[PDB]
Symmetry: none
Subunit: 63 residues, 4 copies
């Protein structure tokens, strides 16, 4: 369906934002000189990205 196709392209692009943003954090992280608390939050944000990435992959898998 073309409506489903358009939706798929938006989600594909959103997945690109998820993965790309996870790469951004990885690139910027060292220059932050994080303590244990900022690190915990960054890791928590990153794990939440990975869940969202998983759900987006499920959607892209099924159509």
């Amino acid at each position: 369906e073309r409506g489903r196709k358009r939706l798929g392209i938006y989600l594909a692009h959103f997945l690109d934002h998820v993965e790309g943003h996870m790469g951004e954090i990885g690139v910027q992280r060292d220059a932050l000189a994080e303590d244990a608390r900022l690190g915990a939050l960054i890791d928590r944000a990153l794990a939440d990205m990975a869940v969202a990435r998983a759900s987006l992959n499920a959607v892209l898998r099924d159509l």
Copy 2:
């Protein structure tokens, strides 16, 4: 770069990014509402959007801790 400038530049990227993806969440939400009633695709999409709301909360906490 010193940690000061690092957190500054990342703080900037994070705010733009949160603003940006909130636009896509709203867009995809409205397109998703045009789907058939109780279409299984819709449920997969709501879960993805919900998980993004979690990520927004947690990324905001990062932003505030810089």
Copy 3:
């Protein structure tokens, strides 16, 4: 500052900016239809995309070599 550590750094920069290309091409593709582009704006956009595509291939060529 040691040469092997800079080549690793550069590899990370390059893989990352390749993610920026993918994100950006996608960005133009989705936001474009909302533009109601005239042909002139439509021509610049196609031009920027083609230029970005040349850039991706010249970034790959660096990453292939190291």
Copy 4:
């Protein structure tokens, strides 16, 4: 409709500032890595191609 040009222009503005920072970083590594001529040349082409890409995107931005 025409609000779709204000949204795209905010994107491109942020994007080009963000890209500018990555070209600087790459430029820094090209300099440190100057002893490898061949790789430096590859990097120069790539940075020049991005320079052209950044100008065409800036053109889009102005025309929005």
